[PDB]
């Protein structure tokens with residue numbers, strides 16, 4: 001899929017010069033149409049399905065008239081100017097290769113702004129850990145899984161969307177960028193989104209990629225459901241990760257469940273206690289009822305891990321339609337560090353990959 | 355504070371008959387004004403600060419013109435009719451005592467519709483259990499506290515507002531009314547609110563009053579913040595309970611924190627683990643920032659209970675402005691029943707009362 005580019009200028013010599021170079025030297029990557037009339041350019045966007053329009057800076061382009069996902073940039077003769085009328089400024093007289101790369105940027109930005117979670121086989125798997133059973137170790141098991149899969153050679157991204165999430169207890173890395181910066185970038189309708197997001201990525205000692213915790217916990221209240229969807233879509237859009245592991249607080253809100261339903265697999269953690277088992281089946285019963293909604297399908301994508309399971313005091317749930325893939329005991333007098341180390345040796349984490 | 359009542363009818367004989375009886379035999383409880391003109395009656399509501407207007411059924415009263423919290427009912431000659439134009443129907447020719455009691459009902463309904471949590475000394479104390487530390491035993495400790503206080507002779511109401519709340523594990527009672535009925539009554543702009551709410555009340559074997567869990571967990575998603583405030587206000591409005599114990603899921607949402615700030619005391623539960631301690635201080639830091647809002651004051655009303663505290667593995671937080679009132683250990687191989695029994699003997703539950 002080549003990028004279709006429209007060029008709008010009164011300098012025909014310039015238009016011919018670019019379209020001539022682009023439709024020969026870059027004909028494998030681009031397909032370029034040129035215009036001297038604004039009305040012809042705008043209606044051609046819709047008709048030819050153009051992905052990037054670049055207009056000369058004196059034009060005032062209303063991008064609502066495109067009637068299509070299509071990026072906008074302005075050509076200029078003025079150096080040192082990053083934006084013109086809120087869009088990327090492209091210097092006419094730099095090297096064509098540099099113009100080309102700016103066009104790719106404008107295309108990328110436009111794609112990144114409407115990214116959404118994908119189930120295509122060439123995108124990262126999205127695995128969401130969640131549980132209605134408090135303190136059963138869901139976050140620890142998710143972190144352990146990320147490490148376990150990193151240990152096997154997977155390129156793993158770890159995303160923690162809890163208000164009081166403990167990302168920084170589990171993973172450490174140099175750098176001052178946090179999830180707060182990620183959120184800011186997603187909310188500012190601003191350019192270079194995907195590069196900004198990539199600059200916030202840290203990498204743990206064991207090779208797990210992640211964003212460190214927001215500077216203060218209340219920051220995460222700023223992220224919407226649309227935003228999480230766009231963020232995960234954008235992480236898949238980076239074409240680097242095998243797997244995205246998301247630690248998501250469980251609840252029965254319809255929008256939470258629609259997000260959950262976009263997971264390739266849902267892993268639920270449970271300790272098999274009386275209150276845990278009861279809580280889970282309370283969740284299960286209402287999920288089933290809510291699966292009457294077209295956009296909600298959850299139970300068929302869930303697998304269960306028992307964690308902190310007492311031989312003497314816990315009991316697995318029977319007669320439910322959720323496969324148990326594994327169990328871990330309750331480690332006595334253990335630190336977080338120790339528990340995670342013990343967990344990463346659990347063979348059942350491989351089952352999440354297949 | 356006597357109820358001020360306005361009567362609107364074209365039958366002056368009838369108006370005189372009632373106002374004569376009411377302003378003599380019921381002059382201690384009521385203060386009654388009568389009208390034959392609609393405009394005089396309506397403007398008198400605002401001016402005299404009338405609490406209940408009763409108009410003859412042929413009148414069409416627009417209660418938005420009252421410009422005041424004031425109940426509306428209709429006088430009728432027709433038996434077997436509960437409502438007229440959406441309001442309580444009052445039979446003219448039943449006993450005056452029965453008319454009186456209907457007026458009290460209309461007044462009560464009107465008060466119940468705008469009930470809100472009170473901090474007055476003659477209303478039930480509102481004690482909210484909440485915690486950002488998952489699975490530390492917050493709900494168990496709240497139930498244990500309710501039982502402990504019942505055991506001392508307190509009239510205790512227990513309210514559980516978790517989606518997957520475990521009320522029915524902790525308390526059992528005969529009856530088919532659940533919290534679902536409570537929610538329905540609060541949402542239907544309908545009469546006898548306080549009597550409807552009272553009909554849903556069950557009483558545990560140990561004397562704790564409560565509403566059993568919603569029929570399905572998703573029902574509780576229907577209750578708003580305004581609704582919880584009105585419900586608790588209405589439970590205080592019943593003038594029966596010393597204390598209302600509320601199990602409320604913690605979060606940093608402003609509306610959650612405004613509700614929390616109406617508590618007379620907030621009890622936070624923590625196990626002193628590394629992840630628990632970390633989560634709490636993440637919450638604390640953002641609460642402090644959010645206390646810049648006028649309607650949020652939380653930290654100064656909090657006390658901490660350590661539950662499941664390991665001598666070997668837990669540590670209390672130092673250098674914080676939250677008083678620890680007590681601690682409980684982690685009971686080994688214990689059922690819910692056993693844990694609660696052991697907890698109700700904790701002397702520190704008395705400190706919640708003083």
Ligand SMILES: Nc1ncnc2c1ncn2[C@@H]1O[C@H](COP(=O)(O)OP(=O)(O)OP(=O)(O)O)[C@@H](O)[C@H]1O
Nearest residue numbers: 134135136137138139140308329330331488627629
């Ligand atoms: N297998 C295990 N053995 C012993 N302790 C464990 C085990 N797994 C987790 N824990 C401990 O259980 C506690 C809860 O862990 P974690 O914070 O991951 O649970 P959660 O279910 O994610 O909690 P929340 O409900 O707050 O999300 C921590 O103290 C953690 O160290």
Ligand SMILES: Nc1ncnc2c1ncn2[C@@H]1O[C@H](COP(=O)(O)OP(=O)(O)OP(=O)(O)O)[C@@H](O)[C@H]1O
Nearest residue numbers: 134273275488489490491492493494662683684685
């Ligand atoms: N003092 C105790 N000793 C041993 N186990 C306990 C103790 N208190 C609570 N528990 C157990 O801890 C688990 C969590 O209890 P509970 O459901 O009350 O926690 P919670 O903090 O309310 O959970 P959630 O985070 O889901 O609200 C249950 O298995 C309960 O039996």
Ligand SMILES: [Cl-]
Nearest residue numbers: 310311312313
């Ligand atoms: Cl055991």
Ligand SMILES: [Cl-]
Nearest residue numbers: 664665666667
């Ligand atoms: Cl110990």
Ligand SMILES: [Mg+2]
Nearest residue numbers: 138139162488
């Ligand atoms: Mg967690």
Ligand SMILES: [Mg+2]
Nearest residue numbers: 134492493516
């Ligand atoms: Mg709880």
